[PDB]
Write a protein that binds this DNA or RNA. Structure first.
Lengths: 64, 61, 64
DNA sequence: CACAACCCATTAACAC
DNA sequence: GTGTTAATGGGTTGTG
């Protein structure tokens, strides 16, 4: 089943992206982030992985 | 990363006789579990290998 | 595994979209489109349903 | 040229 | 219809 991000999960992710400058997190970091985001709903390490890749693609379309 | 010979035979086994192209993450680590016997190993290597091996079969087609 | 369109299947779909002006095909038309594309590879009626919606959205957003 | 490695664009599928 | 998650793929760099 698809992952649907909660408002809290999105803001924590955007926090790490914009204030901590996380772009391609190591698998160790992926486990740390998934661990924190699991408080708000079911989520896997691939979800945060795909989110960072998708968000970088989202950013590069804004600069266009 | 440098693959040992026995890892290549297991990968080519799974790819050519078991018809794995894009293994699911459970399968990725299940392959990794059997490959941990032969040397250094991570889950991303099997991901990268199957992605690269498909590109080669298909570039030559 | 998700459906990946073959080169000739995209050729036929984009033909139907741009030369036959098909946007939201009736379920009968899906069956007929499914018939021809299956003569070229593994597809389902759900694929042609998703594709015409997704290509219309992609063309919509591309205009924006 | 082969090899792993890892981006970058594209998009099918499904959530709403 | 809309938005985005989950992947598929092409191209590129590194190394030999």
């Amino acid at each position: 089943t698809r992952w649907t991000p909660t408002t809290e999960q999105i803001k924590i992710l955007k926090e790490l992206y914009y204030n901590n400058a996380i772009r391609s997190p190591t698998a160790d970091q992926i486990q740390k982030i998934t661990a924190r985001l699991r408080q708000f709903g079911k989520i896997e390490g691939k979800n945060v992985f795909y989110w960072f890749q998708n968000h970088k693609a989202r950013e590069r379309q804004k600069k266009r």
